[PDB]
Ligand binder design. Structure first.
Ligand SMILES: O=C(O)CC[C@@H](O)C(=O)O
Ligand SMILES: O=C(O)CC[C@@H](O)C(=O)O
Ligand SMILES: O=C(O)CC[C@@H](O)C(=O)O
Ligand SMILES: [Cl-]
Ligand SMILES: [Zn+2]
Ligand SMILES: [Zn+2]
Lengths: 147, 148
């Protein structure tokens, strides 16, 4: 429920997400179908509304990354992200609460999410992996985690 | 290889996920492993060297080696995830090792794949450790004709 002296624990979640979600983005770039695109795009639209009404932004952020995991068409990726759901909520909600005290930083975060969608849409697995890990490295650096 | 289409898809899915998880674990282990971690990995490799008598024991020492690499990340969540996947690991590893015993000398070749991961981690070389880990899983998937 907080994060002052919990940085090393946050760093452990983000560092694991970097290997899982980079791999999921690259798989999704190869296997996504029209139904997957709609799931990611609907999450991205709901995330555009939270730029002004920030309630449930954590659920929609998570739903976006879960939609990428579903787009791999690999049941074990999906089950791993559901198994780690509590850690995702901890990391996401900590990162978003921190982000909303600055700028349109929330809008810079929204762009990082869109960049992963865009590379998955193009079917470019290397670009998708790099965009997914950059989102996590930038979220960690915004939290001063030092991975 | 003889497998239903769904079995081949399931095996390909396990190896796909392992490549991302275990490639990352090996890179982290190359940074963080201590002398106890090295002992645990070498203990599994030594047990694997005495292979002939029973394959069922061979499967468990293979999984224990990969789990030891995950524990050597010193990341609470990596180790837990590999335990969570213990049934999928045993499925993949038992299918693979049974298949490799069909070709004379193949099991010794596979053993050098495990040594290469251990050696990279011992040397503290993350990029080398990641490559050896993913290459082991790529070759296993290809021995099984999974067409990843
Ligand atoms: O950096 C943020 O504010 C949000 C990061 C969040 O979207 C995440 O997936 O960790
Ligand atoms: O070990 C568990 O807790 C559940 C195992 C799960 O990965 C499964 O194989 O269905
Ligand atoms: O390919 C083999 O013969 C064994 C593969 C096994 O070591 C594994 O970790 O999946
Ligand atoms: Cl072996
Ligand atoms: Zn996010
Ligand atoms: Zn192995």
């Amino acid at each position: 429920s907080a994060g002052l002296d919990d940085r090393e624990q946050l760093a452990s979640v983000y560092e694991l997400r970097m290997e899982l979600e980079g791999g999921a983005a690259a798989l999704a770039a190869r296997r996504r179908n029209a139904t997957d695109l709609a799931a990611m795009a609907e999450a991205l639209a709901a995330l555009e509304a939270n730029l002004d009404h920030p309630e449930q932004g954590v659920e929609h952020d998570i739903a976006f990354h879960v939609a990428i995991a579903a787009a791999t068409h690999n049941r074990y990726y999906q089950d791993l992200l559901q198994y780690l759901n509590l850690q995702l909520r901890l990391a996401v909600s900590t990162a978003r609460t921190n982000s909303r005290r600055q700028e349109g930083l929330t809008a810079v975060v929204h762009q990082e999410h869109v960049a992963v969608y865009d590379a998955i849409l193009a079917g470019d697995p290397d670009r998708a992996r790099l965009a997914a890990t950059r989102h996590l490295q930038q979220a960690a650096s915004r939290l001063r985690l030092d991975l």
